[PDB]
Amino acid sequence: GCRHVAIIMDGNGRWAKKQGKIRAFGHKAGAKSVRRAVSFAANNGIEALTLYAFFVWALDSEVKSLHRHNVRLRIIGDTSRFNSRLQERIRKSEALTAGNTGLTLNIAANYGGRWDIVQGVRQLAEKVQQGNLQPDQIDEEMLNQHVCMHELAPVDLVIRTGGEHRISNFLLWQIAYAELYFTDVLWPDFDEQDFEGALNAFANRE
Amino acid sequence: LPAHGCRHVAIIMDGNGRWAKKQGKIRAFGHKAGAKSVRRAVSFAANNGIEALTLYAFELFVWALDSEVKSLHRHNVRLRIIGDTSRFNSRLQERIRKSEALTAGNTGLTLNIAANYGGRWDIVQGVRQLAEKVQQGNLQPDQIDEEMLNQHVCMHELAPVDLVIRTGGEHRISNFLLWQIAYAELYFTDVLWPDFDEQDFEGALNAFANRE
């Protein structure tokens, strides 16, 4: 009954080094593993897939395919300091797919869980400053409404590949009740079997 | 300073109910065994250089506060209650006040007991404090950053949480610490809280040391 999976994709670098290859080769294999995880999620009725790299062209090449697959693409994180061209391509890719009803694919870029919260806080603070909001009126529901992804199903499952047992300032507010699944498998090795293994762990919690 | 490199440990103490059920006893017996395991873990932490231990109990809190406080004070433990205590009757609130004041000067372990606590709530009360200052005119919206919000959430004056331990088999935070665990090692063991002892605790610390 897994609706929203988030994944910390760790291990690209150690994978390259184990293969006796340069760091870039690990990334090439990482992108493959992303494609395969995105397909797996859409094929298995998962509503949202949120990915954290722990892109310049990765966007422009892959977007039309995602669109045709009825995938809704979103970038979460601080894109404000990205160059204005890349910001505009992100913007276009988002608007192109915004009406799609299949898998929502969130890519975290220059994202942090504390930053995420702070952005919502600044918004509420702005409302307070202009008299439209009393301090004592602020509650979890309200703050929940201006942290990223508040319009999607709650994060059910966090997967972290690569062996570390940490959130590392990924989603924080959102993972309050999420199943947390850690595997030593390196991200480029992470396949459909590993993904399903994580999904069952969620299943066997309940 | 200590070799395991762990300053602040937080524990979700789960499994009292299952423990009791395994032995054909009602829940209250698991709670009794669990209290014993709290004392044992407080002692272990104090004797192993840990600066702060933070416990999440996953009206009975009343009894505990009474009997345990004197023992804590005599072990030079500094007791703090984190969580929404405004809801409590003015007399339980009072016992909390006195317990804190009595042990505030203590230089050993700082023991934080989470009562009516939630991670999101913790964040929200910090945001209200900032909203207050905004409304007063003292604070500008765009001056709010992470470091500032950090200074308004529970336990900001103590070392960051290095290690979260959850006993009892589940692999989730359950709205325990959220802001504060951004960088913490997360350690899950199947051991039920009443059975969780010094070697289990030592095992978790060693795992933290080795995975750093």
Q: For chain A, what are the domain ranges?
A: 1-206
**What does residue A91 show for φ and ψ, rounded to 5 degrees?**
-55, -45
Q: Coil, strand or helix: which one is B78?
A: strand
A54, A168 contact by CB (below 8 A): yes
- Residue A170's nearest CA partner among A183, A160, A162 is A160
* Buried-exposed string B123-142: b where 16+ CB fall within 10 A, e elsewhere: bbbbbbbbbbbbbeeebebe
Residues of B in contact with A165 (CB under 8 A): 185-187, 211
Residue A114 to residue B139, Cβ atoms within 8 A: no
- B211: Cβ–Cβ under 8 A, 6 or more apart, which residues? A164, A165, B185
The DSSP 8-state label assigned to residue B56 in this structure reads E
d(CA A100, CA A58): 20
H helix runs in chain A, sequence order: 12-18, 23-43, 58-68, 84-97, 113-129, 140-144, 192-203
Q: Inform me whether the C-beta atom of residue A139 falls under 8 Å from chain B C-beta atoms.
A: yes
Sign of the dihedral defined by the CA atoms of residues A147, A150, A151, A154, in that order = positive
Adjacent-strand bridge partners of A158: A6, A180
B73 is in an annotated binding site: no
Q: Inform me whether the C-beta atom of residue A206 falls under 8 Å from chain B C-beta atoms.
A: no
A4, A48 contact by CB (below 8 A): yes
Residues of A in contact with B209 (CB under 8 A): none
**What CATH class has A1-206?**
alpha beta
Residue B146 to residue A175, Cβ atoms within 8 A: no
- Residue A161's nearest CA partner among A197, A128, A125 is A197
Q: Inform me whether the C-beta atom of residue B127 falls under 8 Å from chain A C-beta atoms.
A: yes
d(CA A97, CA A152): 15
d(CA B35, CA B68): 10
A178 Cα distance to chain centroid: 14
Structure-determination technique: X-ray
* Cα separation of the two ends of chain A: 10
Q: Choose the mutation target among B178, B188, B212 for the interface with A, i.e. most A CBs under 10 Å.
A: B178
H helix runs in chain B, sequence order: 16-22, 27-46, 61-74, 92-103, 119-136, 146-150, 198-210
Q: Inform me whether the C-beta atom of residue B132 falls under 8 Å from chain A C-beta atoms.
A: yes
Q: Coil, strand or helix: which one is A181?
A: strand
Adjacent-strand bridge partners of B81: B113
- Residue B3's nearest CA partner among B42, B50, B40 is B50
Considering only CB atoms, A165 lies closest to which of B140, B182, B211, namely: B211
Q: Inform me whether the C-beta atom of residue B187 falls under 8 Å from chain A C-beta atoms.
A: yes
The topology (CATH level 3) of B1-212 is: Undecaprenyl pyrophosphate synthetase (3.40.1180)
**Rg of chain A over all Cα atoms, to the nearest angstrom:** 18
A67 is in an annotated binding site: no
**Exposed / middle / buried, residue A151 (Cβ in 10 Å: 0-12, 13-18, 19+):** exposed
From residue B6, alpha-carbon distances to B9, B158, B184 in Å are: 7, 13, 10
CA nearest to B177 within chain A: A176
Residues of B with a known catalytic role? 14
Adjacent-strand bridge partners of A4: A48
How many beta-carbon contacts under 8 Å exist across A and B? Answer: 112
Adjacent-strand bridge partners of A165: none
A170, A17 contact by CB (below 8 A): no
* Buried-exposed string A175-190: b where 16+ CB fall within 10 A, e elsewhere: bbebbbbbbebbbbbb
Residues of B in contact with A138 (CB under 8 A): 124, 127-128, 131
> What is the DSSP annotation of A118-134?
HHHHHHHHHHHHTTS--
**Rg of chain B over all Cα atoms, to the nearest angstrom:** 18
Residues of A in contact with B136 (CB under 8 A): none
Across the beta sheet with A179-182, the strand order is A72-76, A104-108, A48-53, A4-9, A157-160, A179-182
Instruction: Provide the phi-psi class of A5: left if phi over 0, else alpha when psi is between -120 and 50, else beta.
Output: beta
What is the number of H-type helices and E-type strands within chain A?
Answer: 7, 6
Structure resolution in Å?
A: 2.2
Residues of B in contact with A119 (CB under 8 A): none
Q: Inform me whether the C-beta atom of residue A114 falls under 8 Å from chain B C-beta atoms.
A: yes
Mutual orientation of helices A23-43 and A58-68 as an angle, nearest 10°? Answer: 20
Adjacent-strand bridge partners of A6: A50, A158
**Exposed / middle / buried, residue B9 (Cβ in 10 Å: 0-12, 13-18, 19+):** buried
CA nearest to B144 within chain A: A122
B136 Cα distance to chain centroid: 33
> What is the DSSP annotation of B122-174?
HHHHHHHHHHHHHHHTS--GGG--HHHHHTTSTTTTSPPP-EEEE-SS----T
B13, B165 contact by CB (below 8 A): no
A5, A46 contact by CB (below 8 A): yes
CA distance A197 to chain B (A): 15
From residue A78, alpha-carbon distances to A109, A119, B135 in Å are: 7, 10, 27
Considering only CB atoms, B130 lies closest to which of A112, A125, A181, namely: A125
**What does residue A177 show for φ and ψ, rounded to 5 degrees?**
-125, 20
Instruction: Provide the phi-psi class of B15: left if phi over 0, else alpha when psi is between -120 and 50, else beta.
Output: left
The two structure tokens encoding residue B92: 């339980």
Q: Inform me whether the C-beta atom of residue B128 falls under 8 Å from chain A C-beta atoms.
A: yes
